[PDB]
Amino acid sequence: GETTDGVYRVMTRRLLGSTQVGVGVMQEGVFHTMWHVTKGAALRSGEGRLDPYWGDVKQDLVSYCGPWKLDAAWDGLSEVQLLAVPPGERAKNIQTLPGIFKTKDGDIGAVALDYPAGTSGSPILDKCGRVIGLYGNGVVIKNGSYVSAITQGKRE
């Protein structure tokens, strides 16, 4: 059905009413979301069907209809925009300067904005509007707030 580029909500009718379980990016005919949103299940776009094409639990990413297309990266210096799409609420851009997740295999950018778990898959953008990663996989700091990594896939 709808293949227009943009940000989309991921819904389910399996629980009470219609519940938003996550968000995703449609780019070049491919739907990009986080693995924990769909668990790799098929998606519906009106009457059409989207089937998983690539995915990986450790990266926490999944693509539908084709390979992962998003390959822009955080430059390590500039502010970014979380284009947050919260459940029941309108899409809204939030500007922030990312922090850093220091790991044994290198450093990843991290955005310290706390949003409901159903916001997982919302894109993080650079000044050019390019998607540098998705929000929804991180850690819970001492305060109770969530700090998400800027999770980016690999364009083959």
Ligand X SMILES: O=C(Nc1ccc2c(c1)CNC2)c1cccc2nc(C(F)(F)F)[nH]c12
What does 136 interact with, of another protein, ligand X, none (CB < 5 to 8 A by kind)?
Answer: ligand X
DSSP line for 30-91: EEEEEHHHHTT--EEETTEEE-EEEEETTTTEEEESSS--------SSS-EEEEE--TTS--
**Which one of 32, 63, 120, 148 is the catalytic residue?**
120
What does 4 interact with, of another protein, ligand X, none (CB < 5 to 8 A by kind)?
Answer: another protein
Contact 84, 122 (CB under 8 A): yes
Q: Which of residues 51-110 bind ligand X (CB under 6 A)?
A: 60
> Which residues contact another protein (rule: CB under 8 A)?
2, 4-14, 21, 23-25, 31, 35-36, 38, 41-46, 50, 57-60, 79, 81, 83, 85, 91-105, 110-113, 123, 125-129, 131, 137-139, 141, 147, 149
| Smallest gap from residue 26 Cβ to another protein (A) | 8
Q: Which of 133, 27, 42, 13 is nearest to 80 (CA)?
A: 133
Residue 118 phi, psi (nearest 5): -70, -5
75 is catalytic: no
Q: What CA–CA distance (Å, rounded) separates 9 from 22? A: 6
| Smallest gap from residue 100 Cβ to another protein (A) | 5
Question: Which stretches of the chain bind ligand X, using CB under 6 A?
Answer: 36, 60, 115, 117, 119-120, 136-137, 140, 146
